[PDB]
């Protein structure tokens, strides 16, 4: 691949089943990802996607494009606006670096509230 190559888009609808099932599949039982009343009590609008799911989706997004042979070396997240129930995050990608067979991808996940997550991913072929 080349620097400046853009990954295919991926849009994900954050319905409650998605938010709850991903949080519990990452064994994250914090009430903010499945209990709306506790989320609201703690000052959030609704339940929201957890950080481990962010990591997993970023990983998925890059291997969706790179394919099965890709070896994920690192995933770096800068956390942004919340991904609340019924919001849609759009992942966009751009290759930023290629060197010694080590690829670096900048990933941004955007929803209605703005930039939900910014990610730097390092991988092999």
């Amino acid at each position: 691949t080349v620097v400046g190559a853009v990954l295919p888009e991926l849009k994900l609808y954050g319905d409650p089943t998605f938010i709850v099932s991903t949080a519990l599949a990452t064994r994250d039982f914090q009430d903010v990802h499945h209990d709306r009343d506790k989320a609201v009590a703690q000052g959030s609008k609704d339940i929201f996607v957890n950080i481990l799911t962010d990591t997993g989706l970023v990983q998925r997004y890059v291997t969706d494009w790179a394919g099965p042979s890709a070896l994920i070396k690192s995933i770096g997240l800068r956390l942004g606006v919340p991904w609340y129930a019924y919001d849609t995050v759009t992942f966009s990608g751009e290759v930023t670096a290629v060197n010694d067979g080590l690829i670096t991808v900048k990933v941004v996940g955007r929803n209605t509230l703005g930039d939900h997550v910014t990610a730097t991913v390092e991988l092999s072929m």
Binding site: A25, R27, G56, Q59, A70, K73, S74, R78
Partner: protein, 169 residues
């Protein structure tokens, strides 16, 4: 106790205790929990679920998703951190100083290799840089870094550096 030079001293005191003693994951890396995760995440990567496919890409057999590393050692429903986890003292320190709010700001994970079903992971945590006080959109606060290492036995297999902001709302 009282003030910034004292907060710096307390941070140094916590660090002097050293990293938490390795805590074993509830289960080994295992296919049923991999299945739950790829199901929910919607990641159809064949190497997580098909021994044959986890070989065309060059692995021995099925490998766990790298991004599952933290899942194996999650505390679980109603779990309580061990006393030697520095996270505890550091939150307590800053809450008492009035920095009662918290948000995560950064999470960086490094995967040295892929893990195989049957391998059992341990986790150790250490306090990293603590920086503050700083003026932020959420108010005055301190940025706290924690450094996590995962091992299979004595082999370093992954790490996480993550950062939180403890602040005054």
């Amino acid at each position: 106790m009282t003030g910034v030079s004292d907060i710096q001293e307390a941070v140094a005191q916590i660090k002097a205790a050293g990293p938490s003693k390795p805590r074993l994951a509830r289960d080994p890396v295992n296919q049923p929990m991999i299945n739950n995760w790829v199901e929910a995440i919607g990641d159809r990567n064949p190497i997580y679920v098909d021994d044959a496919a986890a070989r065309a890409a060059g692995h021995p057999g099925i490998v766990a998703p790298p991004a599952m590393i933290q899942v194996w050692t999650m505390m679980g429903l109603g779990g309580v951190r061990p006393k030697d986890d520095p996270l505890g003292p550091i939150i307590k320190l800053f809450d008492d100083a009035g920095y009662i709010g918290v948000v995560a700001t950064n999470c960086e994970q490094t995967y040295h290799r892929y893990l195989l079903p049957g391998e059992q992971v341990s986790i150790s945590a250490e306090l990293g840089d603590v920086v503050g006080p700083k003026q932020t959109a959420l108010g005055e606060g301190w940025f706290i870094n924690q450094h996590i290492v995962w091992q299979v036995g004595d082999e370093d297999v992954a790490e996480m550096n993550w950062r939180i902001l403890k602040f005054k709302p």
